[PDB]
């Protein structure tokens, strides 16, 4: 969850770079995939918790 | 030549045509480099406009913004170099010639069409003159304008 | 490559900076040829008017 405060924050600015124009659409759809891997690790963290 | 000889010509009335062929080139070298400075500062103006929207929020990391706010303020200064370097080479282009900024009656044309003229040449092209307030160089003797100034002690008297 | 938005919009304009400034450099060199072409109209000294010599 400190990675999801980080890599979503990475997504929440690579998206806000594309809304300006600094990155290509790959670096959004990459950074979402690097964000959604954080979910598929953090959900397993919440699953390996239980 | 573009006036009528002996007429009356106002100030700034460009009626000599020095050959622009060299100076139209130096105007185009300079107005080129204005666009070389503008279009280099245009995108230097976008890269602040594209980074101003990320200030306080996340990525732009104020120094990496202020490295672009260098490059906008620095390359807009390069425009101010080049826009004046145009304004230098504009006042060597539309700087041909007539008249010198007096307004009055033009005399001859001591030059004629085709004769090469030089930068601050020895002779003159034409002489614009203004006539209605006119001087007369009265030329007093020296011993008088001691004596007539020493007649201020004995006399004179000049008034009012 | 930005019709389908596949490069940055920034890297485009930065190349469009380089496009427009280098075409502004050619104009600053086509004039520099026009400076030195006009020396070769100043060699081969053209009779600036007609009439008798």
UniProtKB/Swiss-Prot annotation, chain A:
Reading the lineage from the top rank, the first entry is Bacteria
* UniProt-annotated location(s): Cell outer membrane
- What is the consequence of disrupting this locus? Cannot grow on efflux substrates novobiocin or fusidic acid.
This molecule's function is given as: Outer membrane channel, which is required for the function of several efflux systems such as AcrAB-TolC, AcrEF-TolC, EmrAB-TolC and MacAB-TolC. These systems are involved in export of antibiotics and other toxic compounds from the cell. TolC is also involved in import of colicin E1 into the cells.
Q: Per the record, what about its domains?
A: Forms a continuous, solvent-accessible conduit: a 'channel-tunnel' over 140 Angstroms long that spans both the outer membrane and periplasmic space. The periplasmic or proximal end of the tunnel is sealed by sets of coiled helices.
Instruction: Family membership, please give it.
Output: Belongs to the outer membrane factor (OMF) (TC 1.B.17) family.
Listed under subunit, the entry gives: Homotrimer. Part of tripartite efflux systems, which are composed of an inner membrane transporter, a periplasmic membrane fusion protein, and an outer membrane component, TolC. The complexes form a large protein conduit and can translocate molecules across both the inner and outer membranes. TolC interacts with the membrane fusion proteins AcrA, EmrA and MacA.
The name this protein goes by in its record:
Outer membrane protein TolC
Provide the taxonomic classification.
Bacteria, Pseudomonadati, Pseudomonadota, Gammaproteobacteria, Enterobacterales
Give the fragment's position in the full-length protein: 149 to 198 of 493
From Swiss-Prot, chain B:
Entry keyword annotation includes Cell inner membrane = yes
User: Which BP terms does GO give this entry?
Assistant: alkane transport; bile acid and bile salt transport; fatty acid transport; response to antibiotic; response to toxic substance; response to xenobiotic stimulus; xenobiotic detoxification by transmembrane export across the cell outer membrane; xenobiotic transport
- Keywords noted in UniProt: Antibiotic resistance, Cell inner membrane, Cell membrane, Coiled coil, Lipoprotein, Membrane, Palmitate, Signal, Transport
Coiled coil (residue ranges): 20-94
Q: What is its main location?
A: membrane
Which GO CC annotations does the UniProt entry carry?
efflux pump complex; outer membrane-bounded periplasmic space; periplasmic side of plasma membrane; plasma membrane
**Localization per record:** Cell inner membrane
An example Gene Ontology molecular-function term: alkane transmembrane transporter activity
The UniProt disruption phenotype note reads:
Cannot grow on efflux substrates novobiocin or fusidic acid.
Tell me the function of this protein.
Answer: AcrA-AcrB-AcrZ-TolC is a drug efflux protein complex with broad substrate specificity that uses the proton motive force to export substrates. This subunit may act as an adapter protein that links AcrB and TolC stably together. It is elongated in shape, being long enough to span the periplasm.
How does the record describe its quaternary structure? Monomeric in solution. Homotrimeric; interacts independently with AcrB and TolC as well as AcrZ. Part of the AcrA-AcrB-TolC efflux pump. Complex assembly is independent of an efflux substrate and appears to be constitutive.
> Into which family does the record put it?
Belongs to the membrane fusion protein (MFP) (TC 8.A.1) family.
* Name listed for the protein in its UniProt record: Multidrug efflux pump subunit AcrA
| Gene that this sequence comes from | acrA
